[PDB]
């Protein structure tokens, strides 16, 4: 099975109307280090909910 | 749970030993026959000098099944083999004069009272 006519650039754009990425709504701010992080994820320096959970 | 091509033992003394169900009577596209159902059979093996001979086409009533019967309280009564009793092709009366092995009370009907009265044990 294969196309009988070349689909247009218009049809191609309509199909991709749902391919748009959804940016992260908002980052959480740690209460101790004040860093930004994904909610429910530890920070880049190992903080989570105001606690140094990993020492690296 | 008897269907066509099923081989059954004979529970009477009519002379047949092995019969094969060739039709489940009583309804279009009917699939199975339980205890108390009439079936059309052919005789695959008989004793040398019985009342019936190999090749005859008769009717039979199923009296024992491996699938078993279900009682109103949920009980089951299963048997080790399938067995039937040969009936006259048009009169629906038992051909033999004796019944071997137990039967169930599903046969408790005026149509098969002859079988119930002859059975060694009714379950």
């Amino acid at each position: 099975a294969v196309q009988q006519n070349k689909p247009t650039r218009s049809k191609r754009g309509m199909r991709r109307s749902h391919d748009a990425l959804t940016a992260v709504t908002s980052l959480s701010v740690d209460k101790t280090s004040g860093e930004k992080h994904l909610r429910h994820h530890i920070t880049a320096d190992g903080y989570y909910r105001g606690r140094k959970v990993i020492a690296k | 749970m008897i269907q066509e091509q099923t081989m059954l033992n004979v529970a009477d003394n009519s002379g047949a030993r092995r019969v094969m169900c060739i039709k489940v009577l009583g309804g279009s596209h009917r699939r199975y026959a339980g205890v108390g159902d009439i079936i059309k059979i052919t005789i695959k093996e008989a004793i040398p000098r019985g009342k019936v001979k190999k090749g005859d086409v008769l009717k039979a009533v199923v009296v024992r099944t491996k699938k078993g019967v279900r009682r109103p309280d949920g009980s089951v009564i299963r048997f080790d083999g399938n067995a039937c009793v040969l009936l006259n092709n048009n009169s629906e009366q038992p051909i033999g004069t004796r019944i071997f092995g137990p039967v169930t009370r599903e046969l408790r009907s005026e149509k098969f009272m002859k079988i119930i009265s002859l059975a060694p044990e009714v379950l």
Partner: protein, 125 residues
């Protein structure tokens, strides 16, 4: 359908899952904190925490039964000599899953899982 069923398949056969969680449980009690994918971490709880509950009653029967689940005497020793007494008063929930970033190689959701009492005094041994 999957109604009321539990346990993840993790794209492995049964014998591979059993071997993997046996190794992963041994690594968890040896280092007290490891980093793995979030699905593997959640299933590891149903493996390691029953071992800690088992290690609360020291006996040759429990030790052998723990050895059958781990196949490592160094692991069994630490379970009954260290982790048993350390969790004697805690009623379940000996682990803690902390979600972290995504693995660079395949964008897998990673997570740390650690024993809850991995405090500043764990540096003694």
């Amino acid at each position: 359908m999957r109604h009321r069923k539990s346990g993840r398949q993790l794209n492995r056969n049964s014998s591979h899952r059993q071997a993997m969680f046996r190794n992963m449980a041994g690594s968890l009690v040896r280092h007290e904190i490891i980093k793995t994918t979030l699905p593997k971490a959640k299933e590891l709880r149903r493996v390691v925490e029953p071992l800690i509950t088992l290690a609360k009653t020291d006996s040759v029967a429990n030790r052998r039964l723990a050895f059958a689940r781990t196949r490592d005497n160094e692991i069994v020793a630490k379970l009954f000599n260290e982790l048993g007494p350390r969790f004697a008063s805690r009623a379940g929930g000996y682990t803690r899953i902390l979600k972290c970033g995504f693995r660079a190689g395949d964008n897998a959701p990673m997570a740390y899982i650690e024993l809850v009492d991995r405090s500043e005094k764990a540096e003694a041994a």
